[PDB]
Amino acid sequence: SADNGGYVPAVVIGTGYGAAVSALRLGEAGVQTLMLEMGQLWNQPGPDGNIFCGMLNPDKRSSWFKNRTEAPLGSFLWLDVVNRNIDPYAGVLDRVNYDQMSVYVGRGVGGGSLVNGGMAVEPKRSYFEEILPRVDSSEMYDRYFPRANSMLRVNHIDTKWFEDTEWYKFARVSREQAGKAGLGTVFVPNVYDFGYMQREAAGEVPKSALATEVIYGNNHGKQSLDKTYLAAALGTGKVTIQTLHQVKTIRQTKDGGYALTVEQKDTDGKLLATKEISCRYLFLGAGSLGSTELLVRARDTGTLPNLNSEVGAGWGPNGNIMTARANHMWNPTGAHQSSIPALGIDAWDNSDSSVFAQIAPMPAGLETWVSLYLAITKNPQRGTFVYDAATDRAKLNWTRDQNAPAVNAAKALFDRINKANGTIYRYDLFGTQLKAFADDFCYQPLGGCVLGKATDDYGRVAGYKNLYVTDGSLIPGSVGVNPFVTITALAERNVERIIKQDV
Numbered sequence: 404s405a406d407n408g409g410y411v412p413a414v415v416i417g418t419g420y421g422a423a424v425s426a427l428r429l430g431e432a433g434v435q436t437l438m439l440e441m442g443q444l445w446n447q448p449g450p451d452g453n454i455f456c457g458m459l460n461p462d463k464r465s466s467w468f469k470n471r472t473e474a475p476l477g478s479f480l481w482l483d484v485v486n487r488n489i490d491p492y493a494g495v496l497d498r499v500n501y502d503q504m505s506v507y508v509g510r511g512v513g514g515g516s517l518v519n520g521g522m523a524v525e526p527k528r529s530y531f532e533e534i535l536p537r538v539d540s541s542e543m544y545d546r547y548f549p550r551a552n553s554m555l556r557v558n559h560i561d562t563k564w565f566e567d568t569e570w571y572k573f574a575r576v577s578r579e580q581a582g583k584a585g586l587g588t589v590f591v592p593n594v595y596d597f598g599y600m601q602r603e604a605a606g607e608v609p610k611s612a613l614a615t616e617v618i619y620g621n622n623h624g625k626q627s628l629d630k631t632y633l634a635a636a637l638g639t640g641k642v643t644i645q646t647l648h649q650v651k652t653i654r655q656t657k658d659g660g661y662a663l664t665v666e667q668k669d670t671d672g673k674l675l676a677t678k679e680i681s682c683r684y685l686f687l688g689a690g691s692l693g694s695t696e697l698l699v700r701a702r703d704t705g706t707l708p709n710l711n712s713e714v715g716a717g718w719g720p721n722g723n724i725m726t727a728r729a730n731h732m733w734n735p736t737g738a739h740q741s742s743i744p745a746l747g748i749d750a751w752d753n754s755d756s757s758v759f760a761q762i763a764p765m766p767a768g769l770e771t772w773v774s775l776y777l778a779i780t781k782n783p784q785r786g787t788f789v790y791d792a793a794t795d796r797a798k799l800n801w802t803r804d805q806n807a808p809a810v811n812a813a814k815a816l817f818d819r820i821n822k823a824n825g826t827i828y829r830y831d832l833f834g835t836q837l838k839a840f841a842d843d844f845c846y847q848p849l850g851g852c853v854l855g856k857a858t859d860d861y862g863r864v865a866g867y868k869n870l871y872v873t874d875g876s877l878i879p880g881s882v883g884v885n886p887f888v889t890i891t892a893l894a895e896r897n898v899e900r901i902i903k904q905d906v
């Protein structure tokens with residue numbers, strides 16, 4: 404089936420959060436399920452004996468089909484020195500470039516869980532109720548958020564260790580600076596094992612977070628989905644995963660199942676085979692970008708002609724803005740910074756000035772006095788994915804001026820911190836032009852197939868039976884916090900209902 408093309412009861416496209424939840428519960432329900440993942444299974448030791456490259460030694464494993472490595476955003480001034488030309492390869496992190504927006508996504512078994520910062524945050528209930536008023540919030544907070552927390556292996560940093568360790572001085576500095584302006588911080592739960600991280604600092608186990616690894620994968624410590632949901636899904640005996648298989652087209656068969664055209668490639672991107680795979684139940688977990696692209700293509704090329712006009716709409720970058728402050732000489736942030744953030748500034752009150760900002764580490768490995776922040780804001784602007792039949796790609800029509808409300812919210816917060824401390828921004832971290840706020844990237848794409856718009860309230864695609872969307876494309880552009888816990892919890896809610904009523 405996977406091998407030659409054929410029929411499987413359920414197919415799940417992708418292996419990120421929505422996909423992984425869906426496949427686990429399908430398998431536990433006894434439904435034979437095939438997951439199709441375009442990237443690799445990341446389990447083979449590489450030229451350095453490690454699965455993943457670090458941020459100070461990027462190689463082809465860092466990048467999805469690019470010809471040169473790139474510095475982590477914010478660190479070009481210190482990390483461009485380590486960039487090198489590379490072979491285009493099926494690496495783990497893909498910078499997807501649209502007209503006026505670059506979106507970072509993971510590529511591999513586990514999706515973005517391979518490359519993300521592990522920050523596992525529940526949204527504020529009042530904001531959840533605002534953005535998804537058709538969803539029963541009691542079920543979410545009483546049942547599905549706790550379920551997600553537990554399954555994901557969320558854990559909490561030890562406060563005494565945090566207070567003491569050199570590896571979190573950067574966080575304590577921003578906490579103090581924040582405190583001088585009346586802004587409070589919060590600890591951020593994580594899927595990286597904080598007990599492991601303590602042992603890293605003590606020299607007891609191989610370092611990962613404490614060896615400048617995160618955005619190209621963690622060789623140790625991080626409980627990505629391959630270790631949690633996907634391991635459990637495989638354990639059911641009802642789930643298999645085929646890698647380097649990219650779904651290209653979706654059609655409805657004449658008897659109401661689904662048929663897929665699927666390209667199999669090698670890690671150099673050479674096409675090996677094109678296969679037809681069919682199923683009764685089809686679940687899309689290809690992400691905000693990937694799920695939406697499949698559906699706008701299907702609509703506009705006539706293979707799923709009854710998809711509605713909301714497919715493609717309602718995209719936002721979770722209000723993502725990156726900025727940085729220059730510390731006083733007397734406030735060094737340290738040469739040793741854990742690559743996993745632990746603290747944020749919660750200035751989120753659901754108003755338009757809301758900001759939830761994580762205090763981000765920097766990987767340079769020498770003192771720079773820079774404090775870096777990733778701000779999550781409340782900006783009502785949305786973009787639309789539009790199918791381009793000429794190139795066969797979904798184009799995102801978002802313009803940089805659409806991020807002006809996000810910039811304004813972030814700037815008002817950090818202006819308060821600067822005023823209280825007599826500090827200034829950095830203006831040189833994102834390029835040659837004076838620019839203190841990076842306003843054209845996204846790590847947390849949300850929307851394109853919005854819950855209740857393009858789908859019913861459980862992700863059933865409008866116009867079709869047994870066709871489901873499971874992932875960040877469901878969320879209406881913003882959740883006010885790092886999104887994977889919400890994606891996971893919503894997917895738990897959705898698949899349980901779908902299995903009960905439809906399967």
Ligand SMILES: Cc1cc2nc3c(=O)[nH]c(=O)nc-3n(C[C@H](O)[C@H](O)[C@H](O)COP(=O)(O)OP(=O)(O)OC[C@H]3O[C@@H](n4c[nH+]c5c(N)ncnc54)[C@H](O)[C@@H]3O)c2cc1C
Binds near residue numbers: 510515691693697
């Ligand atoms: C650098 C970075 C830092 C981040 N930090 C955080 C964090 O700390 N906490 C947080 O909450 N979020 C974080 N995020 C966002 C988070 O990783 C993201 O919201 C979720 O991974 C999205 O989950 P999905 O299931 O929507 O989707 P995702 O995890 O992107 O998975 C989609 C999967 O589908 C695969 N795929 C796509 N198209 C196809 C196709 N046509 N055929 C086959 N396979 C396909 C794809 O390769 C991938 O493995 C971060 C993301 C990045 C890039």
